[PDB]
Amino acid sequence: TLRAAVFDLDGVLALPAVFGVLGRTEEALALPRGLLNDAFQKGGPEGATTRLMKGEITLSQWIPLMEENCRKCSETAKVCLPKNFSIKEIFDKAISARKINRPMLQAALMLRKKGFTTAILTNTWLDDRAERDGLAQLMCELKMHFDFLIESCQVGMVKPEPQIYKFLLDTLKASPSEVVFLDDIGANLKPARDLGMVTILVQDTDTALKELEKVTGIQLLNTPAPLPTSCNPSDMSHGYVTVKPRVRLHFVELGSGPAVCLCHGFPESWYSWRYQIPALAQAGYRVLAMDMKGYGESSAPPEIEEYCMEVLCKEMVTFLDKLGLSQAVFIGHDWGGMLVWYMALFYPERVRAVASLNTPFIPANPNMSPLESIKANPVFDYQLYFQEPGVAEAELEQNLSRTFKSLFRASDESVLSMHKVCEAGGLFVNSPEEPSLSRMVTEEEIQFYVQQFKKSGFRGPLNWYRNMERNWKWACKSLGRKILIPALMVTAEKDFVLVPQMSQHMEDWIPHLKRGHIEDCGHWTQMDKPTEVNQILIKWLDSDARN
Amino acid sequence: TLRAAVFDLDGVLALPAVFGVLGRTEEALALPRGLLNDAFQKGGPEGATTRLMKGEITLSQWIPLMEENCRKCSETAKVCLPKNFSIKEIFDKAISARKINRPMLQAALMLRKKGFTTAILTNTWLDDRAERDGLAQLMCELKMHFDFLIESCQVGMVKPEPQIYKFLLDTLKASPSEVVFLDDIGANLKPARDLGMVTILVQDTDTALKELEKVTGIQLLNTPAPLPTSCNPSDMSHGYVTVKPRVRLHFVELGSGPAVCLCHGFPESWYSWRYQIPALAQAGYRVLAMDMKGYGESSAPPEIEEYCMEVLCKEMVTFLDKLGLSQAVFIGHDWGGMLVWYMALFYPERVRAVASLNTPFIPANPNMSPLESIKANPVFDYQLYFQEPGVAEAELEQNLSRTFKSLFRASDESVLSMHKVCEAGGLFVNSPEEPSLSRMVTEEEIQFYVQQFKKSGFRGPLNWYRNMERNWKWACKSLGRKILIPALMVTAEKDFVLVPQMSQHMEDWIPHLKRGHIEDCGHWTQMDKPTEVNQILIKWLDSDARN
């Protein structure tokens, strides 16, 4: 029967309620119970606070009008006011002290996820204070989670004016009955009922949620920890930079502050960071999820030489140049991690900080050649299978859907044996024609990769492996250097191709290296353990990057 | 005969020379003349500083090796060292104290402009100091002005090793003879001559320039103040954001820091900021030159309603949302300026600061209607000519090249009389079929606009004028508000459509409004007086925006 849920901002989706400061300020100052509340609502409909609530006057204009009402409310009550009594000072703390009621937001998100139209109905004001940005960020994080956001000072209407409620129904394109309205103020609830729609007086969150969980018939309370926000492609800013006459790199950009460049591995795309792009941004950073040369909307030239580390790095530097960025924090994974390590070893001046996921930094051996060193590792067998041009491409591009469904899998649901790849004569030789669905990705998420690789295919990516000798030589030039800039190495327990032990010596070359580890975590870190990853990176970013 | 110019970094393109600190530190500390210089070059070819110069070891690794040589150079010289003697501390100040030798850079730029292949040949090092970014920015600003940039620690070679010089010739794809090498060190010059190419020992800039001005036969010294850097389209990062299902805005992004959104006017494009995009970025900002809805690579739907201020602003807010930006400094011009004023009046929370060029903020008159108010102004006559759909489009899209060459003109070279436009029955009724070439734009710059408007045409732009009534009504809602956030109004003396006097009252609505004015400046501010504009905006940005 229900199909919509409307949440109030202050007191419901955000706490502590800004309206609640009035009372606290009173007791704290031992003022006549209500003295501040009265001056706040002096004039009812045709009152200053009402005007301010309808966008008639900015908040900075309201404050002075509010001060005077306190000089008269205290005058009639035969009382005074402290000498250090500042209305702005009071609301400033009150507003910045208001945080998102996480459990409530989660419940809202849940509803929407199970086919529900959410929306925020709040009596706000045009904030033009010198700290307005604070409130800005708040609403910025809440917006993206609700189908609608109706602001009083926006629509020129304010609760409980029955009109705005009509506006709501109209905006929700739904009849009252199929709507749930949550608010902490009773007055703002009556109207909702008078029109039909179910209401819920919100005092304490859990209680309200119970009523909600019931009236909606959907488990909201005591629910599992959900996955972090996963950005939607079509709603992302897409950027393009021409690094070379015939090489154009694509990237997804979100957030503001220190630039954090994310470099995915083989065979992925910028989408492999869908779980960290939002989080990192919200953390106060300018995430630049890349589309590494050869993948997605990035140029994918055939020439193998076009994919040797040296050239790859030079273009990344050019990328910084074209964008007007002196430095950048490089975070990689798989081949990406490899890329960032050499970004730090060859262009320190450009790296604010470097972080690798799974990929350990191992200095090339001046004596043994790559081919030899690789054959020395059974699990790297598959890398020999990637050498011959065409062979690997054939099998992988043969059935994209299968290819990705077979690769992107947890450590407990594998179906590919990198063991005797060459032996079997293929990567899928004994894999199902229609693998199950990895608990890490949905049917959709997979098809996204399918459509991407439909463009340039697997040639460009596979070339990253076809420059061992060159990459080797180039690296030998740095055997005398040392990573002395902020570095962080994150290891995956269940990664059976990039075992954590392969980095046990890293500190020898990277003295002040910090670390991270993720229990029961496969090779595809971002997908497998997105929460741990964000937590780990954000932690590291604030301590060693922001500086 | 000559066709190439190679400049050394330290001492030539940048001063004071970092190598020169050695001597100064000596005298300042009353140390044996050379004590520091010796320890610096102890070991010649197979020396620490040489290794550091060939990328064998990072700078942070070198410092310790340099310290010891001073503990031995002072030991043999029978002298000691102060207790607060720090090598890092000395080079830190020395490096950050090095600035771009402007007059030299200018001379280089001049050469290149007159068909010369420039390039930087310097013996640098991989900087991994905690202040590396400083050096990073320096080279970042120099790079873009030279065809090539050969770093010692990069190519593994170092001057005066005759090999690297060969590398140079090869990279310059030119024979010695047609090359000019400038350096402050004599030793680094001999090789150049031994191969042929002309050399110039650079002591004092003016002297070197004279020799250069001569040997090249091109006025370099005592030359006019040049125009600021004008970014090249193909070398800019292009971004796209979908604000609405069928509306996608395009923008050019450059720089890092506080986001500065530039909104052009009718009928331009993001290219109208070609002179401020670089400058502002270099000033420490993240410039986001826009492509206002209806222009260039931005969606241009036919529906007039699609261009009323309210919708235009809502999308700009959505633009911020999709990009993950809580706030942004909005700088507009012409219609753009109009847009930003209403961005501040309706979304203060989102505006870090607002600045308008030419366009004055005039609050709508509750009584008189737009149509009436406009007819009250002779010069606004043309605006009536834009009302009827199709008419205006016809004449303007008829000959793009002519249209833009007739519009974009200085205040002393006009050819269009907005006076009796309706009377004459056209905007070009009595204008030349092939106008001259405005001293503001080149033949090329013009064709860029031509190709842009070839896409969506003049329909979308012209619609900005076709929503007077709506824009009027909407604005009446803010008649009770006031711009109380950082604001800056820049007026153009010779603007005869947007006269400076039209803003004489602005302070009544914008109390703390700051101002700017530009002598003998036409309507197309950015093009006409780019230098003044940058100076003015950057000034305002650091004082009221960065905060």
Ligand SMILES: O=C(O)CCCCCNC(=O)NC1CCCCC1
């Ligand atoms: O666990 C599984 O079932 C499959 C894992 C497949 C990993 C592919 N990544 C890879 O080869 N990266 C290189 C990057 C450069 C260093 C060596 C590894």
Ligand SMILES: O=C(O)CCCCCNC(=O)NC1CCCCC1
């Ligand atoms: O000087 C010249 O020869 C030609 C100037 C042409 C100016 C066109 N700009 C314009 O109409 N802007 C509106 C923006 C909204 C307010 C009114 C002006």
Ligand SMILES: [Mg+2]
């Ligand atoms: Mg409330």
Ligand SMILES: [Mg+2]
């Ligand atoms: Mg020099």
